[model samples]
Target: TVELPGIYQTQEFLYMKSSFVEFFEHNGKFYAYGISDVDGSKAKKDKLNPNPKLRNRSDKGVVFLSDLIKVGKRSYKGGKAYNFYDGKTYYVRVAQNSNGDLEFTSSYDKWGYMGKTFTWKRLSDEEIKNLKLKRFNLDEVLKTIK
Candidate 1:
């Protein structure tokens, strides 16, 4: 079972935190609210931001991989991921590994059967609560989007 507000890892050894901001039928994707960049430059000069600045708690553009509509139980396909850092659209696949960790794999396009899987560790109850609280107003977001 994929948990909400999961803290995942990247191949570059960076920590990415995402949460379920809103949910609607035919779509259930988590948006990134916080990130622990390995380079300690979350707000460094990059494509997302031409000038350096501080990252806020409610920073958008966090969702990279989303799950498409599922037919059976515990079945889903990698939907879409928009890279805020690189400004590109990629696809992802998620599943549990043998080590009891969730794996998030990505590919340039959706045609590939497999891609590099990045290991992700779920945060403790304490961490998840704090993380989810920061991205509150789920009802408002859903209403707005609708």
Candidate 2:
């Protein structure tokens, strides 16, 4: 990635409002096309069920980064939402593999402990986080030891 010419110093460049899916790139190129960003702040604020029975399941953010990279003091990016507006700074490693389709790590757990890997697209904030699950067959995710 190039220096981006003071890219981080612009308002368009804002951080996400979640603990897990940290960083979101607003006003950028995806699939070599400009896609509009959706709102996440007013997104479906799915709170954590402290007592929700489950097994050793975590979000992709935790799984991949834990296995692939060593995270120290870095934060991923975020997107714009009515409710969440720049809460934390997180980063992800987005690489275009041989398949050409982009695969990424997303976290539904606000702090990202129960999440999974998803093929990400330039979707609205909600569509990306919530609705996208439907596309990812979230049913499979819920079956994590059910």
Candidate 3:
């Protein structure tokens, strides 16, 4: 008997349904991942002066990996993430292991590594109240779907 491979799983729904949501490969298979190379030199060279950088919350990438890793398998994020995906909505929450180093936890379907969670600090109440949010929905981005 032959067990051919390369069929996609349920988690691929994000990519299949939402153009904004995507996996790098077809049939929901990937051999690599995203890496955040935040070096001071690179920033300096690129003149990337982000006085305030965005943060990541909700651990969607982690949640994404969880969906693929296995049923009942899970990972933990330990930092306060900014939920970077939310450009229009600025939300703050304390999530599981989200700082300093990448993560690879056990799951039911598959296993993978996630980049480190960024460190975060709280702003003053006034700052929070007056923060100018930069977020928008891009129909153009959605059009890039294949």
Candidate 4:
């Protein structure tokens, strides 16, 4: 079975709104792309408020998740992201939680269980369209998954 590949969102907090992340495959490799970054302050007033300028961050911040990653697999070395904007790298790991949530963990060092963890849940098609969010091309991802 193909692991769900779609847009995911960070949890909404009292202060800021969560952003949208998309995971898709290209040339048999997988990547996590930052799709939409909504301003949290405005989101507090309107949850669906999307900052137009922050859209399409994937063009600059696409993180390579795996060369041939699968759904429901634990991936280390999956979180080392190269920020094209600043040319810096951050360490991280990724996996699917039991609840089917995407568990994204980060570490200062290469290997270890120590690091801050964040849970991102899959976003629905309705959210994708309504939010005017762009995600990893589902067609290409499904083509790989199939």
Candidate 5:
């Protein structure tokens, strides 16, 4: 949906211990990437990236979630979600909850069971402006993915 792309802060961000994600559309598909740290710091490196070329790059704008295809109203499936913590990519599904939060469920198995889900609250326009969050150079990152 058009409303999906924006800045979303996770619960971890509220706890002041992690980062926010910026969801954006590219080539008619939905994608997201980690942005700034909760305290307004730049994101750390993608040390666990499966690709060595991407491993040393800052996570600030790396496409952690890629090619989310719409499956239903406000719901999407079909994507690879990169987990820096474990250096793995898992199948992912995303949906907008009734309350307007993004629900991300990732799994190691294709059936999407026995996995973990995380919630991310969309930030307000004022919050985005105040935080000065900016999208990374998509061209640069996309090139590396190629």
Candidate 6:
């Protein structure tokens, strides 16, 4: 099994521009979730969610990335990622580039041939502690699925 990287954030100025994602292994599979930003603000409702039941729910701590199947030593694919900006979900491929930053390639199709890629900078351990962000409990999140 390969160890995935820790929390990564979209860069903007000196702070996170918009969102942050935390990646970790669960039961031997890789999964990732969107966490609150550095200021610890609550996210707006998932109004754009595809599911009607989840549309009114808060987006904070939601699992936006899931079931990342391994494709290579330093890469993985087959994860579904939801983009809150456009209220669209895409199949995502994740890889650690040479610079050690994470490159997320997302596409509307499963093969990801026409995907757009974005880079996320890795956060330091100290920065993570300083942010004091609250992580979503998967079990608790699951309970609200219905």
Estimate TM-scores for all models.
Answer: 0.53, 0.22, 0.19, 0.57, 0.84, 0.80
Q: How close is candidate 5 to the true structure, as a TM-score?
A: 0.84
Off by over 4 Å in 4: 1-4, 11-17, 40-77, 83-87, 136-146
Better of 2 and 4 by lDDT: 4
Each model's RMSD to truth, in Å?
6.3, 16.2, 17.1, 8.4, 2.8, 3.5
Give all candidates' CA lDDT scores.
Answer: 0.44, 0.27, 0.21, 0.53, 0.76, 0.72
Per-candidate clash tally:
1, 23, 15, 1, 0, 0
Best by lDDT: 5
Candidate with best TM-score: 5
lDDT of 3 at 144: 24
Per-residue accuracy of model 3 over 1-146 as CA lDDT, tens digit each? 11111111111122122111112222332211111211211111212113223232221221122112111222232212122222221111112222212222221221113332222222233532344221122333222221
Q: Candidate 5 overall Cα lDDT vs. reference?
A: 0.76
TM match of model 3 to true structure: 0.19
After superposition, the stretches of candidate 1 with alpha carbons farther than 4 Å from their true spots are 1-62, 71-75, 97-100, 129-133, 140-146
- 3 or 4, which is superior by TM-score? 4
List candidate 5 segments past 4 Å from native. Answer: 13-17
What overall lDDT, based on C-alpha atoms, would model 4 receive against the true structure? 0.53
- Count backbone overlaps in model 5: 0
Candidate 5 residues 50-114, lDDT tens each? 77877787766677788888878788888787877668889988889766688878898775786
Model 4 poorest 10 in a row by lDDT: 40-49
Tens-place lDDT digits, model 6, residues 11-126: 44333256777787666667777787655566788877777877877666667777787778788888887766567878988888665578778798898888777788877778
Per residue, candidate 4 scores C-alpha lDDT tens digits across 1-146 of: 33636678866545425767676656655666555565522111111214444333333134433343453354434446443333344566667755557777656676636666778887667867887764555554343221
Worst 10 residues of 5 by lDDT: 10-19
